[PDB]
Design an enzyme around this catalytic site. Sequence first.
Site, PDB file in Angstrom:
ATOM      1  N   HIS A  53       0.764  -1.227   0.070  1.00  0.00           N
ATOM      2  CA  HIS A  53       0.012  -0.018   0.149  1.00  0.00           C
ATOM      3  C   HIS A  53       0.938   1.253   0.011  1.00  0.00           C
ATOM      4  CE1 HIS A  53      -3.564   2.394   0.182  1.00  0.00           C
ATOM      5  NE2 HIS A  53      -4.280   1.698   0.855  1.00  0.00           N
ATOM      6  N   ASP A  71      -7.842  -4.001 -20.610  1.00  0.00           N
ATOM      7  CA  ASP A  71      -7.555  -4.840 -21.499  1.00  0.00           C
ATOM      8  C   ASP A  71      -6.205  -4.883 -22.122  1.00  0.00           C
ATOM      9  OD1 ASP A  71      -7.679  -6.006 -24.095  1.00  0.00           O
ATOM     10  OD2 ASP A  71      -9.708  -4.780 -24.706  1.00  0.00           O
TER      11      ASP A  71
END
Length: 440
Positions: free
Chosen positions: A165, A386
């Site tokens: 994180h 994608d």
Amino acid sequence: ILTVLEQSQVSPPPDTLGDKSLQLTFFDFFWLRSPPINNLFFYELPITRSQFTETVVPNIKHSLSITLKHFYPFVGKLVVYPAPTKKPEICYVEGDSVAVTFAECNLDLNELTGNHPRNCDKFYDLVPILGESTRLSDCIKIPLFSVQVTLFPNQGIAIGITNHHCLGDASTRFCFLKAWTSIARSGNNDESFLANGTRPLYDRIIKYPMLDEAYLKRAKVESFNEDYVTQSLAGPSDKLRATFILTRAVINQLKDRVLAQLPTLEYVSSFTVACAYIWSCIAKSRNDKLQLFGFPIDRRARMKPPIPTAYFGNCVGGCAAIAKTNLLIGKEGFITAAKLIGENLHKTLTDYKDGVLKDNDLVSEGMPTTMTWVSGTPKLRFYDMDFGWGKPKKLETVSIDHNGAISINSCKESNEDLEIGVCISATQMEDFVHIFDDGL
């Protein structure tokens, strides 16, 4: 069930990046002792073993390599020093690389990409470990980002991404993934990204040194090196993972109910209504005493002055509500939940407008018997990522399994619908499903 095909190391291209550091802020220091974040992207495609080896493997390596030259901290390490003076930082040094695992899984992909209860532990060998730390004389170095690409022969591909994180928040990850996918889609070429894409902003525009030091104290930095241990997920487990859908139509009907019953409630959104509903379900499921429910807030636009979207790193706030479980159950419980979330969020956002940066109360006021923290920001469309094979069939945040957490994200047949991910024990899942479905 899982075969490792290749353990590779991916670096930026030769003669592109020198040694580079990134200084951190209190927003980043907050996450010093956090467990890894694990995410999966599942893709459907009739891909053979031979084709996976021939094009996918080289394309992943090449496209990631090129992306790394623009996103240096992703190939860097978190560096923590024992001296209370020298602040942790992200360092990239020539030679540093990202661990990229290529694997093959013989489980049916259709048994993983659905929304109904599936064993949580079936997902663990699809996400990479963050990676072993390097312990030196003057510091410890921790990897920030790792990747696993898993072939499901003749069915598809899962991409597992693990990160610390401290590297950055969901916005930072989104920025990176937009770049990587662009570079991959356009045949391992950053021409399109450089012309049209959103480049990360490394300028250190959040400068609050007193907050920096306060947050490091809370995260106990002098003992960090001594205390740091790996936190990988491993089975076996009886827990089940399911995805619950709140459609735009259902959300609007729930919202209308809140607005009708509480006409002067200052804050009501699709997100708060979704949270309120799941909150009520969790209350019914647990039948406990006292509950806390909370979620992150992207603070960039709310800063004074506003922080650009492309700012690299963490810029996250949070909001939570606490209520007795009996007040959260049923139709009236959902309304109460929406009220408390709405009130507390309104207060939090007002504080941000006023420029408030900060923020055993529980020991005194009452210990919650359940606590739930939301992972996710529905505004960021990870379902659009994608690499060249089409958009993901399914996303999973595997790291919610570690602690009191659920995931909330947008869907991809619709960006107005919400997907809620839950991983809970098998005994509790059966009831939870009925609670969620029956309540709607």
